[PDB]
Amino acid sequence: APRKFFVGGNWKMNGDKKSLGELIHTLNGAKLSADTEVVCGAPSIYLDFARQKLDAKIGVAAQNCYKVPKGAFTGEISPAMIKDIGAAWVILGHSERRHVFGESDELIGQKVAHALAEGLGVIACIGEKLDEREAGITEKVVFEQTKAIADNVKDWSKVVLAYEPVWAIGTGKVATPQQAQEVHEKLRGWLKSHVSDAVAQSTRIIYGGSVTGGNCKELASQHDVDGFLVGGASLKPEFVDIINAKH
Amino acid sequence: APRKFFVGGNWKMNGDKKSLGELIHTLNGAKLSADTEVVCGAPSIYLDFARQKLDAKIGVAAQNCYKVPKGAFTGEISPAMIKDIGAAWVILGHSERRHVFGESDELIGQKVAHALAEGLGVIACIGEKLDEREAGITEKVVFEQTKAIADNVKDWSKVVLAYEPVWAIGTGKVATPQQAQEVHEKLRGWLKSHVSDAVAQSTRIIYGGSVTGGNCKELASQHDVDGFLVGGASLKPEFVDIINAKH
Fold first, then answer.
1. Which of A44, A85, A96, B229 lies 20 to 30 Å from A173 when distance is taken between CA atoms?
2. Any alpha helices (H) in chain B, and if so which ranges?
3. Cβ of A73 and B170 within 8 Å?
4. Which of A13, A41, A70 faces B77 most closely, judged by CB atoms?
5. Contact across the interface for A81 and B12, Cβ inside 8 Å
6. CA contacts within 13 A on the Cβ side of B207
């Protein structure tokens, strides 16, 4: 019945071996709630190193992958490679991929289908831009993004949806608890009606966008917020407090 | 005064620890000519592994990087990370990045300037499509691509230019020796008039696109071909024959 609370840290394009080493030591030595599923998204060049150093209860995620196992795609990595080094998750459809690197809903869907077929878990990101929210079409936008993912998902047990409003990512402008709840509730209703009641009730829908130690507890108390995707604060000691937001 | 012959292997999106370990074991034990500079371009997720396992005389390259040292670029790596794991080269502007992933000349120029500022070597790729070649504008296209790079190079000592006709990549349609030589001497001539005589005589211009152990010797004996960028054949034992193309 109860969805396990989920906190992912997305380190983005940050770190070197020595500074990530220090972060990993802090996380390994910290008291992390046993009721939180924790996943760290490391830059591709440090995925191996991170999986080797992190305690086994912390999952490792890649920050992107491509949509076939192998081939003539200079610069890309595939789900087979991610699994080879022992990572169990991949983040797909991140806002930075969609808006800086031009990844379309079609390509993201194809990535989701492929990562799931290869046995990875997927954190699939959706979210509206500021102009979209101000025009009052948030629902339309997130439903459309969600549909593009859902059309490529057979088994939902390994999917986490991350609602991250683009205007809240890296800016410090966090969504209010009520803004986040309204969207998660609607998304969960979308799952009920377009997939099944059982998938709606078991799928984690996490919030991301300027989550800090200072604001996480009120966010986490909302009934449809199942955890967080944390960027900037995942590089700080306060990541520990976010993992422990329900305690 | 003579330009050191240069052979790069671009593994593209291929391999796992087992298969790459075997390849590396073969290269470390091979009878490799002392007069050839060799660089292996690994998938980002294996860069660390490859640098640890490959003999020090063999250089390691990233297959791509981004244009700043750090930040909110989920899925990207920077020159500082590449340096951190001990790789000394990056491949930029590869055909697959241009045509599959939409990287523009402007972006590639910025990546080049940044990689060089951080102290990496760059293997910068240019080349025309079939329809451009048949329309008689090969020269125009490669000069425009070369200028976007060159306007961003302060120090040519760590630059290698790679001419790869798009139509020869992965197709088995290798350029004839006279096709490659035509373009390479025109490029060297462009360098002489737009940069300097010293830069024209010391910059390696390497050919890529369906280079094999069977066709490499005739290409290598051309006066302005200084080596190769090898895709498909870099995953095979004949890669050693290519390295030894002048013997």
1. A44
2. 17-29, 47-53, 79-84, 95-99, 105-117, 130-134, 138-150, 177-194, 197-202, 216-220, 239-243
3. no
4. A13
5. no
6. 31
